[PDB]
Amino acid sequence: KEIDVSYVKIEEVIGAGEFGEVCRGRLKAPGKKESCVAIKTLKGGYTERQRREFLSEASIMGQFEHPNIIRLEGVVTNSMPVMILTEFMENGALDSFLRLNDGQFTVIQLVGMLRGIASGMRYLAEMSYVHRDLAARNILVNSNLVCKVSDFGLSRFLEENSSDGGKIPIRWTAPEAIAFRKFTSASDAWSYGIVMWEVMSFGERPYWDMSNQDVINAIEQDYRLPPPPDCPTSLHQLMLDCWQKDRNARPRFPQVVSALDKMIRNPASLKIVA
Numbered sequence: 001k002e003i004d005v006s007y008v009k010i011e012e013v014i015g016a017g018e019f020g021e022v023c024r025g026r027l028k029a030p031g032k033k034e035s036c037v038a039i040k041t042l043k044g045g046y047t048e049r050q051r052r053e054f055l056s057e058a059s060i061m062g063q064f065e066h067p068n069i070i071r072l073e074g075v076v077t078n079s080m081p082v083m084i085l086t087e088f089m090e091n092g093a094l095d096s097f098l099r100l101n102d103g104q105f106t107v108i109q110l111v112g113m114l115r116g117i118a119s120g121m122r123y124l125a126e127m128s129y130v131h132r133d134l135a136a137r138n139i140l141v142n143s144n145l146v147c148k149v150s151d152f153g154l155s156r157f158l159e160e161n162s163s164d165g166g167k168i169p170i171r172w173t174a175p176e177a178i179a180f181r182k183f184t185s186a187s188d189a190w191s192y193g194i195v196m197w198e199v200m201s202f203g204e205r206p207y208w209d210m211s212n213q214d215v216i217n218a219i220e221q222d223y224r225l226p227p228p229p230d231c232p233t234s235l236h237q238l239m240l241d242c243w244q245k246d247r248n249a250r251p252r253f254p255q256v257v258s259a260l261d262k263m264i265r266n267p268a269s270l271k272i273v274a
């Protein structure tokens, strides 16, 4: 959906993306009430390939409609700067948000965040979309703490293309995906276990200071991340389920959502901690 630039007001620069600024603004279109939007801008000096890659995120977002997937409002393509407008997520990226708020949300709140992410992923999997970069940094959080999946793009990773999309995010990536480049919803479930860990640790770095090769070797040698401090054992177990080496043994996302829904219904179960 092409948006008349007269309908957009940019208020403030709030971040930086791959190709430019991320801004907060207002969208007001005839017959609709004004709303808050995030706006990515692309200014002068990029190649047409770069323009296409930038706008591809909009094309992909626009294929989806789900409360846990970032909503596209529209694009500005007949004018400079080129823009992508989405719903505005007041609290930004989940990893940074949790680090700011370390120890300040309850286990039940954290599980609700995890449930929203898992519902987004359930939907993407149903739509046969493999995310491939599922990480807390790619989860955006609104004022009501609703978590939504972001970062959409279909470009192959640099390792997949010519001998001579960016690099595979090793610490989030399932071993078979690293080894063979087979990305599936089941490799996303692995990544989701890593997101669970990031959430229950209030945004700590998966595998701390381990190198990417250290991580690859550790996982092959049966190492798995330990329960974060105060983490309910049942959540750690679901993490371990996501991190099975055999991808077919991992839970699919409907199962992940169910498990989380049970926990919310049965909060006493969350009291068991190592």
Ligand SMILES: NS(=O)(=O)c1cccc(Nc2nccc(Nc3c(Cl)ccc4c3OCO4)n2)c1
Residues within 6 Å of the ligand: 014, 015, 022, 023, 038, 039, 040, 057, 070, 084, 085, 086, 087, 088, 089, 090, 091, 092, 093, 140, 150, 151
């Ligand atoms: N807490 S804060 O107000 O300082 C802040 C900072 C950065 C981003 C925020 N929300 C924020 N909300 C929605 C989206 C977004 N970034 C973004 C992505 Cl990830 C993809 C595509 C796109 C985007 O903006 C429009 O087009 N960001 C909020």
Ligand SMILES: [Mg+2]
Residues within 6 Å of the ligand: 131, 132, 133, 151, 152, 153
């Ligand atoms: Mg991606």
Ligand SMILES: [Mg+2]
Residues within 6 Å of the ligand: 133, 151
């Ligand atoms: Mg990415």
Ligand SMILES: [Mg+2]
Residues within 6 Å of the ligand: 153, 165, 166
């Ligand atoms: Mg990317």
Ligand SMILES: [Mg+2]
Residues within 6 Å of the ligand: 201, 202, 229
């Ligand atoms: Mg801590």
